A paper describes a structure:
To better understand the nature of the NTD–RdRP intra-molecular interface interactions and whether they regulate the RdRP fidelity, we designed point mutations at the Y471 and E472 sites in the context of the WT NS5B and the N- and C-terminal deletion mutants. The other two structures, obtained using the C-672 construct bearing the Y471A-E472A double mutation (C-672_AA) and the C-672 construct with the E472A single mutation (C-672_E472A), were solved in a space group different from those of the WT, C-682 and C-672 structures. Very interestingly, the C-672_AA and C-672_E472A adopt a drastically different global conformation with the NTD–RdRP interface no longer maintained (C-672_AA structure shown in Figure 3D). The NTD–RdRP intra-molecular interactions are fully disrupted, and the NTD is rather involved in a non-intensive three-way interaction involving two symmetry-related neighboring NS5B molecules in the crystal lattice. As suggested by the two open conformation crystal structures (C-672_AA and C-672_E472A), the NTD–RdRP disengagement might occur in solution. In the chromatography analysis, the crystallographic open conformation C-672_AA and the C-672, or the AA mutant and the WT, had consistent retention volumes. By carefully comparing the proteolytic profiles at representative time points for all three constructs, the AA mutant also produced a few proteolytic products that either had obviously different amount from the WT or were consistent with the characteristic products of the N-91. These observations suggest that though the closed conformation is dominant for the AA mutant in solution, the open conformation AA mutant likely exists in solution as a minor fraction.
The global conformation of our CSFV NS5B structures is consistent with the recently reported CSFV structure with an RMSD value of 0.9 Å (95% coverage) between the reported structure and our representative C-682 structure. The NTD interacts with the palm of the RdRP core intra-molecularly with a mixture of hydrophobic and hydrogen bonding interactions. Collectively, these biochemical data indicated that the RNA synthesis fidelity of CSFV NS5B is fine-tuned by its NTD through the intra-molecular interactions with the RdRP palm.
Residue numbers in the entry: 13 to 88, 90 to 123, 131 to 531, 538 to 671
The structure:
């Protein structure tokens, strides 16, 4: 017989759930005969069968090949990353993504923009053709979306020069802050929850959102935080959706409608529980609570971005400004990069939390991404746009690279950098200010030094970087400095943009007079230099003064808007005596070329304001310097303040 040898193997064939769905044969009944396996896992002494007339040896022949098969797949395989192997389970279909430079194992089982009633109506009444105004919320087809991944996302990590990331540390070793070293730690549930979008998007396998995760399974996030701190691999996946998909939702407050506009076609975001797990821990770094990365303006509000800068620009014997057009930055992040920012995080975080960093970064190098339609792909490094670390990390990266490029092109020591240039960034977008001498070197030798670093500039001109020679040619956060002159003869620069582009952003929604006002106040803080837009905002704010403003847009106001504006701008809207002559030409010209306004549109808006603030009394529209001037009245405003979120 053969049983005494069948008992040998069975104490080695793997365990299983005793399943009655078929024929579980006996530890000896195998040597009987005609009882050959069709499956292996043992139920404390059974396997499958087939009644296939097998010989008491043909059984052992077959089974032992399954044990060889099992001891093979398991234990003694490859692919899909060394930590990401879990994702093979959730596959069901073979995958059509046609990706040439990264994996693609299969697929899984799988917001219109409307007009602002009041604000739109205001515009038309003056001659503004909304038909002739840019569309600023277009979506994208999935056919087009699929090609967006191949065109932009599937690529091998750029070639970053030998011993570069040592020089980048060499750089960060100048701008480090020993006063905070090994100090950061997790934040409590209140400080995290204070500013948090209760409707923050959920991962592909999730069903609740940021709020509900907070409401109910707060302990589930405490798990993700524990294991990561202890050193364990966590099921890290990212989800990928197109831009302006219903699930493109910011967990933090945007200081402008430009942030969601400097977004990439392809948004990659981790499970919402995982967004919290990272953030209750890395809050001090990711939000950048103390600000550590020099020149990071992501916490600065838009109205002072340029006021603050012109205080620097006005110090250089002869200053120039140079821009950073990194071609689709996010897909230009190598794995040594993410390992650099990793070391940084560990410079400021405590000792207990390094493992967290150590672990989380490992996952962030080999990232499985599930698409909207189920098509999972593996990302070759790079930054997912919706990761908590995006603004925080990306920015550190930008200055370190760009410092490196600036010193590498000019020979200025990394230590002596602040003595010869100033740097402002905002994630990947930024610029740098220095003398005409130095700027020109960095301007030409820059496209090269930078492509050499894996951060390739755009197509540009003759391979020179973008150089701003006069201050009001700078671009930043998608706005440009325009200058205003006040009652008291002072100058001060405001955040300029194109009139058409503002009217487009302002009239449109995304699937409510109180909201329409909060928009017109939020637009006034930035665009009061633009009289067409100033007069519009006053005309809207002055409607339905009963109705308190809404709170879902960038800013809003508590009390008398013209007093709130005063609190944040440091000047009364009435004090706006003149807007820069030439710079207002440029930003208004788009309007004549698209034909969005008429000869009569300028005067007609003003007349509506004078027609309104002429009746005896204290009328909002009279906040405009000229309106009040020809309407004889003035606006006497009560206590008012500015808020956000």
């Amino acid at each position: 017989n053969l049983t005494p040898l069948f008992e040998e193997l069975l104490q080695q064939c793997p365990p299983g759930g005793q399943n009655k769905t078929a024929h579980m044969v006996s530890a000896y009944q195998l040597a009987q005969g005609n009882w050959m396996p069709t499956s292996c896992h043992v139920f404390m002494g059974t396997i499958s069968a087939r009644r296939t007339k097998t010989h008491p040896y043909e059984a052992y022949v077959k089974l032992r090949e399954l044990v060889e098969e099992h001891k093979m797949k398991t234990l003694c395989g490859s692919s899909l990353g060394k930590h990401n192997d879990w994702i093979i389970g959730k596959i069901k279909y073979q995958g059509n993504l046609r990706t040439k430079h990264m994996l693609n194992p299969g697929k899984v089982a799988e917001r219109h923009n409307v007009y602002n009633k009041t604000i739109g109506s205001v515009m038309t009444a003056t001659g503004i053709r909304l038909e002739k105004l840019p569309v600023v919320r277009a979506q994208t087809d999935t056919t087009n979306f699929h090609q967006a991944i191949r065109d932009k996302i599937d690529k091998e990590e750029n070639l970053q020069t030998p011993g570069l990331h040592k020089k980048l540390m060499e750089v960060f070793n100048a701008l480090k802050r020993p006063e905070l070293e090994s100090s950061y730690d997790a934040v409590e549930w209140e400080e995290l929850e204070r500013g948090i979008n209760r409707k923050g998007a959920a991962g592909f396998f999730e069903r609740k959102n940021i709020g509900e995760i907070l409401d109910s399974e707060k302990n589930k996030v405490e798990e993700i935080i524990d294991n990561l701190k202890k050193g364990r691999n966590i099921k890290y996946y990212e989800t990928a959706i197109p831009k302006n998909e219903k699930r493109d939702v910011n967990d933090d407050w945007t200081a402008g409608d430009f942030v969601d506009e400097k977004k990439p076609r392809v948004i990659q975001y981790p499970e919402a529980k995982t967004r919290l797990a990272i953030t209750k821990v890395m809050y001090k770094w990711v939000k950048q609570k103390p600000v550590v990365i020099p020149g990071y303006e992501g916490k600065t509000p838009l109205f002072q971005i340029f006021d603050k800068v012109k205080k620097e620009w006005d110090q250089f014997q002869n200053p120039v400004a140079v821009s950073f057009d990194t071609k689709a930055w996010d897909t230009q992040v190598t794995t040594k990069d993410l390992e650099l920012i990793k070391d940084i995080q560990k410079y400021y975080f405590k000792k207990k939390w390094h493992k967290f960093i150590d672990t989380l970064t490992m996952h962030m190098t080999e990232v499985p991404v599930i698409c909207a339609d189920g098509e999972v792909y593996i990302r070759k490094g790079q930054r997912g746009s919706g990761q908590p670390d995006t603004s925080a990390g990306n920015s550190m990266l930008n200055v370190l690279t760009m410092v490196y490029a600036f010193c590498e092109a000019t020979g200025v020591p990394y230590k002596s950098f602040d003595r010869v240039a100033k740097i402002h960034v905002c994630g990947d977008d930024g610029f740098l200010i220095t003398e005409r001498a130095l700027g020109e070197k960095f301007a030409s030798k820059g496209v090269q030094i930078l492509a050499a670093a894996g951060k390739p500039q755009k197509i540009t001109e003759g391979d020179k970087m973008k150089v701003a020679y006069q201050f009001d040619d700078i671009e930043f956060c998608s706005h440009t400095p325009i200058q205003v002159r006040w009652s008291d003869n002072t100058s001060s620069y405001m955040p300029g943009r194109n009139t058409t582009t503002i009217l487009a952003k302002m009239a449109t929604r995304l699937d409510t007079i109180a909201y329409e006002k909060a928009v017109a106040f939020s637009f006034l803080l930035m665009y009061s230099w633009n009289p067409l837009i100033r007069r519009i905002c006053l005309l809207v704010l002055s409607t339905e003064l009963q109705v308190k403003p809404g709170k879902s847009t960038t800013y809003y106001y508590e009390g008398d808007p013209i007093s709130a504006y005063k609190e944040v701008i440091g000047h009364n809207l009435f004090d706006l005596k003149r807007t820069s002559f030439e710079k207002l030409a440029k930003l208004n010209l788009s309007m004549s070329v698209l034909g969005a306004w008429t000869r009569h549109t300028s005067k007609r808006l003003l007349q509506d304001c004078v027609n309104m603030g002429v009746k005896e009394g204290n009328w909002l529209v009279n906040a405009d310097r000229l309106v009040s001037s020809k309407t004889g009245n003035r606006y006497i405003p009560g206590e008012g303040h500015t808020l956000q979120g």
